[PDB]
DNA sequence: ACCAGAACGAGT
DNA sequence: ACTCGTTCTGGT
DNA sequence: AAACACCAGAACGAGTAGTAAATT
DNA sequence: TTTACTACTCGTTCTGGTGTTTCT
């Protein structure tokens, strides 16, 4: 099939007449299990019958579950027949280091470009020039933490002399939560794409379970810093509502305005194709 | 020496329901049941034949109401009883003592 | 397999006195304490190290009020426990069963 | 966990205060989530919430979903089950053939060795002698499929010589019912131990578990044996007893869940680095 | 009963719901009346009701009243302690000398025999030999007061040779404190067993008990021995231990109350009719 | 001493300055322990100190106790010195059968004459003559139960065709309780006199613990029958108050009117003296 | 985790 | 009432 | 769907007051 | 000086209801 159903509201999913019933307050929608490639449950509120699960495996659909933090936790695994997304895990292991190095260089280049461009939009001309000077020519597989210096410059221009994790103000009371609010998107997309977040490109650190999720969210990070910077002086309890504009607001991708959910889905798919050495252009997110 | 705990739950909605709770409590205190806690009463029986005799007496004097439950523990467990907050009953009736001084121990 | 009974009386006169009874009862039900009777709660602990671990957890989560008393009985005595009037709790959580059928036993 | 939960009737399974709540029109029940080990949802009438599924996968309960014939068809594998998960996966890539060959030859030795004891209990001394010709005359990487030949000899001693494992009988269906329950057990233990069930020590989603389980395969060919005559419901019911009965492992009698958990953790110890011994079950 | 109750302070002892209630301004206590065995009111400040006395005498607690020096001076004798009391009195009139002589010679044999073991514990082999000359060379009706001579030899081994039982000091005061406690025990047991304490098997109100007690007299001369040095309060406190400690009788270890009740019940069996054996205590 | 003290009401007895203090609602009386021969506690309401008991044995006083039914239950027994009433028990045993036979013959003679005289006062002339003829010459140590026939005649004339213990009316609801209300008097007096109620004159039955009490009360039973016969038609609840006239009403004894307590005390003392072969005339009670 | 000792309960 | 067997706890 | 919060209700439970009775 | 009522009184106690909130 083609449709990937994302159940993110209090619902009741059941099965009658080869049709996924997705009942809620708004619309007791009708969806055909023939079309459903991947059912993705995005909340803990949803109620699903065992009969539906029986006929979600019969049609070979990936039933992914999510916990309270909207993060992937378990995918329903069939004994007999398996989805078409169960072969990427066996090729993700055999991913060559060269494609990982190139795609990481591109992702980090996009991160520095986004931070420098937003600094240009943050009324810091010399700081924007310095941020681009950190990556005037993107250091090909930089061994040292030059990205550390670039982040230092960007966060110094953004949030003041220090924007590290130590300070307890909305500098981290918002950036921490937002940076976990988008980690859920990339983790969920990576597991949807049939990939394993646990092992990712340039993820030499084994301390992070969400390796590929963070590594591919690196380009999409500056949205959170932008929304925080605009509403920085406000309290954190206000930022809990301010940061939610990500889903409502549409950003430019592929030349057109799209919701960030569609953008992260497309970006994750294109990066996954790139690491498969399909030859596709590593996707770009910049404004 | 073993202890018996008689946890009971008995309804109080009618006169006959409360006219047998009072009788049950009078019987409990009459036969020497130390109030461990509210509705939890305990007695120290010196041998097993005492336990059998008083089980028979309780069965003969059943209020036939609510939920009355007997647990029989060895004195080891009733002495290993752990009090998170509160104090043990220090009365003489709660001890397996044979020499008892309601007064000054000569030590 | 041994049972643990946690008999408690805890005062209810101030807000802080009732704000820790509710927390204590939420903890008791959260850790799997079956309400034997009003204020008498029981848990089936499969080995002694579980008893030590949960004694430590209870000590760490003490309401620091009233009279909370722990008795640890072997499952023999919790099964020889005599009900004068009333019925045993027949729930699955109250048994030492390892094969449990929420449905029809195939017999 | 220690309890095994089998839900066969229409109900709704929900979460409340670290408890699984079962609500049929007749009854309401609560089981503490630490007690449950297996949740076998045989019937297609269970209406279980997704909030229950989250707490179930954090507590690592082996939730198994079946089909209309009450035959297992799916189960839940947690994406993130161990803190060291990424390390174990990265090391799993670094699983050279030299350690894999030794681990598989050890495990196949254990499988044939445990096959011999059932023949001893099946009153087949000559069939046990053929199994011993395959066992002492052990094979490395099975050049002649001596494991398959030993399995065929054990079956010929076990079932009729004409009978084949692939053919469809009541025995040949329960012998796979039990295999699917055990496969779920070992898949859960592998994924909890940080490894990947989809890799294989000698692809397919259960290749790792399908080998580590092999020494415990005769546990299923004996319960089916002793009750081979009767109908499928009976062999299914006695197959359920693996969760309840007790089997001897190491130097002590432990339930099969603990044997599965311990065995599935020692093999990973040796595969990770050549500093461990593959344990033997009998 | 099994508890022993010693009230040494100002109080009021009352009755409520089959309980003895002790109320000092410091404390209030309740003891179930079936548990109590001895109520030793040492102090002259106890204010006890008469309703308590009735329930005490129906339950047969040995209530003992003392004097200013906390020395026993009185105790309660139940008029009606046995349903068969009148028949035991009428038979007690029919107590011929032929059975009395045998019972008394048996009891005096037990007393001297039990005296010998203390000399064995007192490291006096020659004094034990003199006691054995009195014991094996036993006397019938004490023609030469051989019981008194054996007691004198045991005392000379026990106390200094110059010391006499009638003389006054700490030792010969506690030796009578214990004798009065034991005499109360045996008087209670005789009156409960339906007999008359005032009759004698060989008048005076305690003649029956003063002979039945005789084999248990060395129970008191050993506690006084082991603590003879210290002041009277110490020997009194250790004398209180007869109620608490355990002594070997028949083939089992029982507290001295059970030995007293048991011993005082087969003697009456033999005196009533010559169809019983006088039990030996050691 | 000479005074016997009968503490019959709710009291508090204590000891100060060689004086028994007998406090109650009416009079906190002063009694000297030198004069007190026998202290007799008659009820369960009395409170006594242990100090008083110490100085009750020191002066060698018999401290007799009574239970809820006002019946002797226990006398305080001293270890060292003893009362002058502790020698009768050891001479009661040696009482000869001849004195008991004579005293029983006179006792049952008084019973039969009392019943016959009351029948003469009960408007039964022929029955009075028949009761007198049952003992026209008092059968010297009658072996058979001729007294049974005399009682049959008396009770047939009194309460109708049958006055046995079976009938549940006031015939036994009053006579039985009243016959236990005077048994208390004789039991208490016999134990006060230093005698044992357990063995009594002509008391062949061993089922009777109150042998001598009943044997000496036989002449005094008829008062209860008179009192019930006067109030026979009334209910037993009323007879519980009617029967209490025994203590208040005074009857003729020794030629003068006295309370029945004094009469029973003197009668018991004289019967005990006669059983002692002192030669005193066995006392007489008849109206 | 296993083994040994002690205590408790049941049966003769 | 005594003795043996079973189980529970403590220690290495 | 579930956790957290307190508020309110109906039931469980012991103690204290008061009256009555107190020799089958 | 106890026991035998029922009465009432204040404390223990569990459940139900309504609101609020939710990826640090
Ligand atoms: Mg209760
Ligand atoms: Mg309670």
Coordinates of N, CA, C and O in Angstrom, one line a residue, chain E residues 50-138:
Chain E
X50 N -13.5 -6.8 96.6 CA -13.9 -8.2 97.0 C -14.5 -8.9 95.8 O -14.4 -10.2 95.7
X51 N -15.0 -8.2 94.8 CA -15.5 -8.9 93.6 C -14.4 -9.5 92.8 O -14.5 -10.6 92.2
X52 N -13.2 -8.9 92.9 CA -12.0 -9.6 92.3 C -11.7 -10.8 93.0 O -11.3 -11.8 92.4
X53 N -11.8 -10.8 94.4 CA -11.5 -12.0 95.2 C -12.4 -13.2 94.8 O -11.9 -14.3 94.7
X54 N -13.7 -12.9 94.5 CA -14.6 -14.0 94.1 C -14.1 -14.7 92.8 O -14.0 -15.9 92.7
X55 N -13.9 -13.9 91.8 CA -13.5 -14.5 90.5 C -12.1 -15.1 90.6 O -11.8 -16.1 90.0
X56 N -11.2 -14.6 91.5 CA -9.9 -15.2 91.7 C -10.1 -16.6 92.3 O -9.4 -17.5 92.0
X57 N -11.0 -16.7 93.3 CA -11.1 -18.0 93.9 C -11.9 -19.0 93.1 O -11.7 -20.2 93.2
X58 N -12.9 -18.6 92.2 CA -13.4 -19.5 91.2 C -12.4 -19.9 90.2 O -12.3 -21.1 89.8
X59 N -11.5 -19.0 89.8 CA -10.5 -19.4 88.8 C -9.2 -20.0 89.5 O -8.3 -20.4 88.8
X60 N -9.2 -20.1 90.9 CA -8.1 -20.8 91.6 C -6.8 -20.2 91.4 O -5.8 -20.9 91.1
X61 N -6.7 -18.8 91.5 CA -5.4 -18.2 91.6 C -4.9 -18.2 93.0 O -5.7 -18.0 94.0
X62 N -3.6 -18.5 93.3 CA -3.0 -18.5 94.6 C -2.7 -17.1 95.1 O -1.6 -16.6 94.9
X63 N -3.7 -16.4 95.6 CA -3.6 -15.1 96.1 C -2.9 -15.2 97.5 O -3.4 -15.8 98.4
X64 N -1.7 -14.5 97.6 CA -0.9 -14.5 98.8 C -0.8 -13.1 99.3 O -0.3 -12.2 98.5
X65 N -1.1 -12.9 100.5 CA -1.0 -11.6 101.2 C 0.2 -11.6 102.1 O 0.4 -12.6 102.9
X66 N 1.1 -10.6 102.0 CA 2.3 -10.5 102.8 C 2.1 -9.4 103.9 O 1.0 -8.9 104.1
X67 N 3.2 -9.1 104.6 CA 3.3 -8.1 105.6 C 4.2 -7.0 105.3 O 4.6 -6.8 104.1
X68 N 4.5 -6.1 106.2 CA 5.3 -4.9 106.0 C 6.7 -5.3 105.5 O 7.2 -4.5 104.6
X69 N 7.3 -6.3 105.9 CA 8.6 -6.8 105.5 C 8.5 -7.6 104.2 O 9.5 -8.2 103.8
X70 N 7.4 -7.5 103.5 CA 7.2 -8.3 102.2 C 7.5 -9.8 102.5 O 8.1 -10.4 101.6
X71 N 7.0 -10.3 103.6 CA 7.1 -11.7 103.9 C 5.7 -12.3 104.0 O 4.8 -11.7 104.6
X72 N 5.4 -13.4 103.3 CA 4.1 -14.0 103.3 C 3.5 -14.2 104.6 O 4.2 -14.8 105.5
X73 N 2.2 -13.9 104.8 CA 1.6 -14.1 106.1 C 0.2 -14.7 106.0 O -0.3 -15.2 107.0
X74 N -0.5 -14.6 104.8 CA -1.8 -15.2 104.6 C -2.0 -15.6 103.2 O -1.3 -15.1 102.3
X75 N -3.0 -16.4 102.9 CA -3.5 -16.7 101.6 C -4.9 -17.2 101.7 O -5.4 -17.6 102.7
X76 N -5.6 -17.2 100.5 CA -7.0 -17.5 100.4 C -7.2 -19.0 100.2 O -6.6 -19.6 99.3
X77 N -8.0 -19.6 101.1 CA -8.4 -21.0 100.9 C -9.8 -21.1 100.5 O -10.7 -20.8 101.2
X78 N -10.1 -21.7 99.3 CA -11.5 -21.8 98.8 C -12.2 -22.9 99.6 O -11.7 -24.0 99.7
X79 N -13.3 -22.5 100.1 CA -14.2 -23.5 100.8 C -14.6 -24.6 99.9 O -14.5 -25.8 100.2
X80 N -15.1 -24.2 98.7 CA -15.6 -25.2 97.7 C -14.8 -25.1 96.4 O -15.0 -24.2 95.6
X81 N -13.9 -26.0 96.3 CA -13.0 -26.0 95.1 C -13.2 -27.2 94.2 O -12.8 -27.1 93.0
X82 N -13.9 -28.3 94.7 CA -14.1 -29.4 93.9 C -15.6 -29.8 94.0 O -16.2 -29.7 95.0
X83 N -16.2 -30.2 92.8 CA -17.6 -30.7 92.8 C -17.7 -32.0 93.7 O -18.7 -32.2 94.3
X84 N -16.7 -32.8 93.7 CA -16.6 -34.0 94.4 C -16.0 -33.9 95.8 O -15.6 -34.8 96.4
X85 N -16.0 -32.6 96.3 CA -15.3 -32.3 97.5 C -15.8 -33.1 98.7 O -15.0 -33.7 99.5
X86 N -17.1 -33.2 98.9 CA -17.6 -33.9 100.1 C -17.2 -35.4 100.1 O -16.9 -35.9 101.2
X87 N -17.2 -36.0 98.9 CA -16.8 -37.4 98.9 C -15.3 -37.6 99.3 O -14.9 -38.5 99.9
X88 N -14.4 -36.7 98.8 CA -13.0 -36.8 99.2 C -12.8 -36.5 100.7 O -12.0 -37.2 101.3
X89 N -13.6 -35.6 101.3 CA -13.5 -35.4 102.7 C -14.0 -36.7 103.4 O -13.3 -37.2 104.4
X90 N -15.1 -37.3 103.0 CA -15.6 -38.5 103.7 C -14.7 -39.6 103.6 O -14.5 -40.4 104.5
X91 N -14.1 -39.8 102.4 CA -13.0 -40.8 102.2 C -11.8 -40.4 103.0 O -11.1 -41.4 103.5
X92 N -11.5 -39.2 103.2 CA -10.3 -38.8 104.0 C -10.4 -39.2 105.4 O -9.4 -39.5 106.1
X93 N -11.7 -39.2 105.9 CA -11.9 -39.8 107.2 C -11.5 -41.3 107.2 O -10.9 -41.8 108.1
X94 N -11.8 -42.0 106.1 CA -11.5 -43.4 105.9 C -10.1 -43.6 105.3 O -9.9 -44.2 104.3
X95 N -9.1 -43.0 106.0 CA -7.7 -43.1 105.6 C -7.0 -43.9 106.7 O -6.5 -43.4 107.7
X96 N -6.9 -45.2 106.5 CA -6.3 -46.1 107.5 C -4.8 -46.0 107.5 O -4.2 -45.5 106.5
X97 N -4.2 -46.3 108.6 CA -2.8 -46.2 108.9 C -2.0 -47.0 107.9 O -0.8 -46.7 107.7
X98 N -2.5 -48.1 107.4 CA -1.7 -49.0 106.6 C -1.3 -48.4 105.3 O -0.1 -48.6 104.8
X99 N -2.1 -47.6 104.7 CA -1.8 -46.9 103.5 C -1.0 -45.6 103.8 O -0.1 -45.2 103.0
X100 N -1.3 -44.9 104.9 CA -0.6 -43.7 105.3 C 0.8 -44.0 105.5 O 1.7 -43.2 105.1
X101 N 1.1 -45.1 106.2 CA 2.5 -45.4 106.5 C 3.3 -45.7 105.2 O 4.4 -45.2 105.1
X102 N 2.7 -46.4 104.3 CA 3.4 -46.6 103.0 C 3.7 -45.3 102.2 O 4.7 -45.1 101.7
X103 N 2.6 -44.5 102.2 CA 2.8 -43.2 101.4 C 3.8 -42.3 102.1 O 4.7 -41.7 101.4
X104 N 3.8 -42.2 103.4 CA 4.8 -41.4 104.1 C 6.2 -41.9 104.0 O 7.2 -41.2 103.8
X105 N 6.4 -43.3 104.0 CA 7.7 -43.8 103.9 C 8.2 -43.6 102.4 O 9.4 -43.3 102.2
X106 N 7.3 -43.7 101.5 CA 7.7 -43.4 100.1 C 8.1 -41.9 100.0 O 9.1 -41.6 99.4
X107 N 7.3 -41.0 100.5 CA 7.6 -39.6 100.4 C 8.9 -39.2 101.1 O 9.7 -38.4 100.6
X108 N 9.1 -39.8 102.3 CA 10.4 -39.5 103.0 C 11.6 -40.1 102.2 O 12.7 -39.5 102.2
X109 N 11.4 -41.2 101.6 CA 12.4 -41.8 100.7 C 12.7 -40.8 99.6 O 13.9 -40.6 99.3
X110 N 11.7 -40.2 99.0 CA 11.9 -39.3 97.9 C 12.7 -38.0 98.4 O 13.5 -37.5 97.7
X111 N 12.3 -37.6 99.6 CA 13.0 -36.4 100.1 C 14.4 -36.6 100.4 O 15.3 -35.8 100.0
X112 N 14.8 -37.7 101.0 CA 16.2 -38.0 101.3 C 16.9 -38.3 100.0 O 18.1 -37.9 99.8
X113 N 16.3 -39.0 99.0 CA 16.9 -39.3 97.7 C 17.2 -38.0 97.0 O 18.3 -37.8 96.5
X114 N 16.3 -37.1 96.9 CA 16.5 -35.8 96.3 C 17.5 -34.9 97.1 O 18.2 -34.1 96.5
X115 N 17.6 -35.2 98.4 CA 18.7 -34.5 99.2 C 20.1 -35.0 98.7 O 21.0 -34.2 98.8
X116 N 20.2 -36.3 98.3 CA 21.5 -36.8 98.0 C 22.0 -36.1 96.7 O 23.3 -35.9 96.6
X117 N 21.2 -35.8 95.7 CA 21.7 -35.2 94.5 C 22.3 -33.9 94.7 O 23.3 -33.5 94.1
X118 N 21.7 -33.1 95.6 CA 22.3 -31.8 95.9 C 23.7 -31.9 96.5 O 24.6 -31.1 96.2
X119 N 23.9 -32.9 97.4 CA 25.2 -33.2 97.9 C 26.2 -33.6 96.8 O 27.3 -33.3 96.8
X120 N 25.6 -34.3 95.8 CA 26.4 -34.6 94.6 C 26.8 -33.3 93.9 O 27.9 -33.2 93.4
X121 N 25.9 -32.3 93.8 CA 26.2 -31.0 93.2 C 27.0 -30.2 94.2 O 27.6 -29.2 93.7
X122 N 27.0 -30.4 95.5 CA 27.7 -29.7 96.5 C 29.1 -30.1 96.7 O 29.8 -29.6 97.6
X123 N 29.6 -31.1 95.9 CA 30.9 -31.7 96.0 C 31.2 -32.2 97.4 O 32.2 -31.9 98.0
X124 N 30.3 -33.0 98.0 CA 30.4 -33.6 99.3 C 30.1 -35.1 99.1 O 28.9 -35.5 99.3
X125 N 31.1 -35.9 98.8 CA 30.9 -37.3 98.6 C 30.7 -38.1 99.9 O 29.9 -39.0 100.0
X126 N 31.5 -37.7 100.9 CA 31.3 -38.3 102.2 C 30.0 -37.9 102.9 O 29.4 -38.8 103.6
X127 N 29.6 -36.7 102.8 CA 28.3 -36.3 103.3 C 27.2 -36.9 102.5 O 26.2 -37.3 103.1
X128 N 27.4 -37.1 101.2 CA 26.4 -37.9 100.5 C 26.4 -39.4 100.9 O 25.4 -40.0 100.8
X129 N 27.6 -39.9 101.4 CA 27.6 -41.2 101.9 C 26.9 -41.4 103.2 O 26.2 -42.4 103.4
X130 N 26.9 -40.4 104.0 CA 26.1 -40.3 105.3 C 24.6 -40.3 104.9 O 23.8 -41.0 105.5
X131 N 24.3 -39.4 104.0 CA 22.9 -39.3 103.5 C 22.5 -40.6 102.9 O 21.3 -41.0 103.0
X132 N 23.4 -41.3 102.3 CA 23.0 -42.7 101.7 C 22.9 -43.7 102.8 O 22.1 -44.6 102.7
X133 N 23.7 -43.6 103.9 CA 23.5 -44.5 105.0 C 22.1 -44.2 105.6 O 21.4 -45.2 106.1
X134 N 21.6 -43.0 105.6 CA 20.2 -42.7 106.1 C 19.2 -43.1 105.0 O 18.1 -43.4 105.4
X135 N 19.6 -43.1 103.7 CA 18.6 -43.3 102.6 C 18.4 -44.8 102.4 O 17.3 -45.3 102.5
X136 N 19.5 -45.5 102.0 CA 19.4 -47.0 101.9 C 19.1 -47.6 103.2 O 18.2 -48.5 103.3
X137 N 19.7 -47.1 104.3 CA 19.2 -47.5 105.6 C 18.0 -46.7 106.0 O 18.1 -46.0 107.0
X138 N 17.0 -46.8 105.3 CA 15.8 -46.0 105.4 C 15.0 -46.4 106.7 O 15.2 -47.5 107.2

